[PDB]
Structures are given as C-alpha cells and as structure tokens.
Amino acid sequence: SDSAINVMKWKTVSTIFLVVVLYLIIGATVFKALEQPQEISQRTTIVIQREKFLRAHPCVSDQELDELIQQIVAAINAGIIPLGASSNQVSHWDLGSSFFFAGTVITTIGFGNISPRTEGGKIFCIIYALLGIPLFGFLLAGVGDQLGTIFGKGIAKVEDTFIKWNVQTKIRIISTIIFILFGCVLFVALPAVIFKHIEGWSALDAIYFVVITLTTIGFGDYVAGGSDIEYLDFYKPVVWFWILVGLAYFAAVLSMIGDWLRVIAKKTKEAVGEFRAHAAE
C-alpha cells in the first residue's frame, strides 16, 4: 500500500518515457526529412560563393578569409551593422530593449536575439531569473484567473440561450469550442495579422511566431522587437502585454491538450486490452 503503489508508479513513468523517446525519434526523422534538402542546397551554394570570391580576388588572403568570417560570426553574436555606410548603429541595449529583454527572462521565452555578454550581466541574469521566474508565474496565474473568470461571465450568457428542450454534459463540448474559437482569434489570428502588416512577415511566419512565442519555446528566429524598421513605440509595450495574456491562453490550451492526452491514453489503454483479449484469441 505504501510502496506497493510506488511499483505501479514506476511502471507508469517508464512507459511514458518510451512514448516520449519514440516521439522524439519520430520528430527527429521528420525534421531532417524536411530541413536536410534545404540544408544541402544552402551548404553547396555557399562553397560556390566562396570559390567565386577566392578565385576572382587572388590577392586576398586566401586562407585568412575564414579568419575574417569567424570575426563576423563573432560580430553576429553581438548587435551589429558592419558596413561601409551606416557607421552610426542603433542600441540593442537601449532604454526599451533591456525592458523587453527582462520580459524574455522572467517569462522563460528567452528569444536569445539579445543576450548578456558581461560577466556581471550573466550573474545578474541568473539572479534576475531565479527570482523573476517565480515572480512572473504569480502574475501569469492572476491574469489566468481573470481570463478564466472573464470567460466565465461571457459563457454564462451563452450557456442559457442554448437551453432548449433536450439539451449539461453535452453542452460542455460547445462551450469549450467557443473558448478555442474566440481564443485563436484574439490571441493568435488578430496579433498575427498585425505582425504581418508591421514586421513584413508572411502568413505562416506570423502564426509560427505566435505559437513559438506563447508556447514559451521562443527560438528567436522571429522576434517582434528584433529589427530596426520603424517601431512606433506604441508597439513594443503592447507586444509583451499581448504575451502576458496570450501565455495565459496557451497555458489553458496546452493543458486542455494534456487532458485530451489523458483520455486518449486511457482509451488506447483499454483498446489494447480489448484487442489482446478477443479476435479468436
């Protein structure tokens, strides 16, 4: 009873582990099947642009070119505009950017477009995160509570007008759809349409960014406050504000998918029992 269920626990964990391993193997085989074709073509067309510049300029230091490229690669890790023209650059750590950077830290999005290179900044970031991450979780919980109860008001009016004859257990389906329906409008679609017309992104690049942002994965390959274009500055505030509330939306969405995985686990759990039982033994 005390450590007898602990055996029933460890058997549950190991089985999850392998489902995750398989899922990482499946995802692996899919991604390289999707990216390796465009990898090689970019890998092979960059050696041609090497030989095109090695040979056309014999007087350049033929092998010290990679020495230069590595220094530009080292410059890439900083915020740079290394050009003949445009010798006055912009601050990547300005009064507004460091504010947005702190938002990447406590939310654990961490786009990485701007990362600290100072040993003091590194240590502060460590202390700023370890105390700021729990701080934000309480704000996100409070906002998630507000949205949870804001939606509770808006669904109360919707769960009475649909009360015809022969309607509670099958109304919980239609009311969770309007959460997704309205939800992916205000927190995915509408901010994606805005990003498309402000950052110049494509259709998918906007939705891809919203997902990567609000899933707090944050690759940083797309960031709303990365480039220099115009940035009204009525724009950088509403972004992290959107993030604050949008995170609360996916927090439910991801957890709803989680419960959808609970059921499908059980339903395949019993269906494997059905199948191994019957079918002419």
Ligand X SMILES: CCCCCCCCCCCCCCCC
| CB closer to a second copy out of 141 and 271 | 141
Look at residues 102, 107, 113 and name the one whose alpha carbon lies nearest to residue 134: 107
Rounded CA separation 180/193 (Å): 18
Q: Does 115 interact with K ion (rule: CB under 5 A)?
A: no
Residue 234 marked in a binding site: no
Rounded CA separation 193/207 (Å): 9
Measured in whole angstroms, the distance separating CA 158 from the mean position of its chain's CA atoms is: 32
| CB closer to ligand CCCCCCCCCCCC out of 197 and 269 | 269
Residue 85, both tokens = 């023209």
Considering the complex, what minimum distance in angstroms separates the CB of residue 110 from ligand D10? 21
Residue 16 marked in a binding site: no
Considering the complex, what minimum distance in angstroms separates the CB of residue 268 from ligand OCT? 6
Residue 109 marked in a binding site: yes
Task: Judge whether 129 and 106 are in contact, CB under 8 Å.
Answer: yes
User: Exactly one of 74, 127, 150, 190 binds ligand X (CB under 6 A); which one?
Assistant: 127
| CB closer to ligand X out of 167 and 211 | 211
DSSP character string of 91-133: -TTSTTHHHHHHHHHHTT----SS---SHHHHHHHHHHHHHHH
Angle between helix axes 203-214 and 190-198 (nearest 10 degrees) is: 120
Site string for ligand CCCCCCCCCCCC, 10-49 (x = CB under 6 A): -----x---x------------------------------
Q: Does 73 interact with ligand X (rule: CB under 6 A)?
A: no
Quickly tell me which residue has 């626990």 as its tokens: 9
Binding window for ligand CCCCCCCCCCCC (CB under 6 A); candidates: 30-38, 183-191, 227-235, 258-266: 258-266
- Contact residues: K ion, CB under 5 A: 108, 110, 112, 216, 218, 220
